[PDB]
Symmetry: C2
Subunit: 315 residues, 2 copies
Amino acid sequence: SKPFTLPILTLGELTNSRFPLPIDVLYTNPNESAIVQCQNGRCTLDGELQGTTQLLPTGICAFRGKVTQQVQDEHRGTHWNMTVTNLNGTPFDPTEDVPAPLGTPDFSGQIYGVISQRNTNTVPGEGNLPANRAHEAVIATYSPKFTPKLGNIQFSTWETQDVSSGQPTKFTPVGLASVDANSHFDQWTLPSYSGALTLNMNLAPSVAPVFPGECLLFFRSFIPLKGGYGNPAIDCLMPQEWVQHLYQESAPSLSDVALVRYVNPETGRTLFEAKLHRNGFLTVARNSAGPVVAPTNGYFRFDSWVNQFYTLAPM
Amino acid sequence: SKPFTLPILTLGELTNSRFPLPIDVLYTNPNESAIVQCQNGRCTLDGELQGTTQLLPTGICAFRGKVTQQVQDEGTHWNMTVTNLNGTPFDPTEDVPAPLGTPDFSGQIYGVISQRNTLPANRAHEAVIATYSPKFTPKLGNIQFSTWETQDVSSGQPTKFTPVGLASVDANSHFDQWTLPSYSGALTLNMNLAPSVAPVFPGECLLFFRSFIPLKGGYGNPAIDCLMPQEWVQHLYQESAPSLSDVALVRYVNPETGRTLFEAKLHRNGFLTVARNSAGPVVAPTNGYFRFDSWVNQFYTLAPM
């Protein structure tokens, strides 16, 4: 049995699996009322990707496809429909057992980024090179027009005309447009991947602590804003590098729970211990919300396989 | 002796180490006249990061700092002090060419500047950093970016540059992926550089991992070629396997058929050569990936492609 391992990476060497951001802090929120069921950054300890999770850091909250036409929408701005493919350019097959194309955003909000286009057709007078354009854009994932499982989404621009129909189009995510009440940011609310009033399918399962006194432990990143007030964050269950490592190793899981220790390598001391669950998430024994204030040189080390009955030393 | 290994990843599972892009194709260009001495995506086979290379995919061509002054070019420019990406002050006496993650090529890099004030107020705008400009002096702790926005950028507030593509590849935009910026300005020599790379055996050429980079406007199909993908940098850093010679033999394999499509030399300093006498993409099945075979030497003759 190939021994289970985690990469050796400090917080300052990790990135978020739910948005292209560095990990800023470890975080807990025990009184969270929402069901935690994110779809990016989902991977079992034996290397099975789940939900909409894919391996590329460039693929998280990205889209690839083609603009069809400008469309009318009651909301502010200029709106555009785009078909979407798989990130690798192949047609998205809705019959595959996934919730949406891999990399699709997994939360409600106004995602801000850049739409760019490189034309298929080239100009002989320009050395047989294609024309290009890029503009800021917003994708409202709670919109009834957000239907990535059906191979179509909509985005809005401040630019009023310089977006071309029928041309290859890329969305590069950057942050959120707003976190005002009217922008419906909720990191634990899933989009409706096939539109208003349909049930999502093929989801990665919800995660929760089951042992009294335990809460989920998250890898938290602060996400940029185009405007307005706020300090919004995106919390992932495991960083993207862990997804990548587990996928590579695919080590057999010898129980449902791996005991891990958060260590300071200089001192050699254990700062705290955590349970790393088979389905790919952490719990700790902690009774407060907020950041974990820990030495910058810290990282998780696999200790041993334990079981559900194991009692964690309080943080 | 910890055995050397490469990750098991198809091209479709790899990202560029010189710009935040997926790898699109493997690529050669034997008649390249420029010295190849990129500074991102540089790592020895035994796990030593070099140049401006760091581990985060989000750190490649990124900056962090604070804006200090608005200056109208006659679009709007903004002077920016830069720190290390982790927020600590950049120490110019450290043995690096510039803050880790600093872009390693000449051009107009297009992206988004965002700010969160010290609930806080926020703003973000499209921005361009001309890395060939006299004002591009990251080794001295300062750079300049330009915006189409004329006023709504704040001074003395935390600022992030998220790279997206290039502004232009027109003649006057000075895009050249193999020309290094002058990290301290035009009259000063760059220092602490990762070494240049080249084939040393007749009939060999460099093999690159190529990504196409977006453009804000204009005509073009620009690309950025890296020596190894970011995942290889990350893997080598993790493993730190001792290098048993100066050259590793690797094979590009189709795992379904088990057949080797071609072989390449993976050199100690962290780059590939192949025996190919043509320029352009390598046409290979999407399931293919490189596997370590054995340690060889400079005199080893690669099977021609």
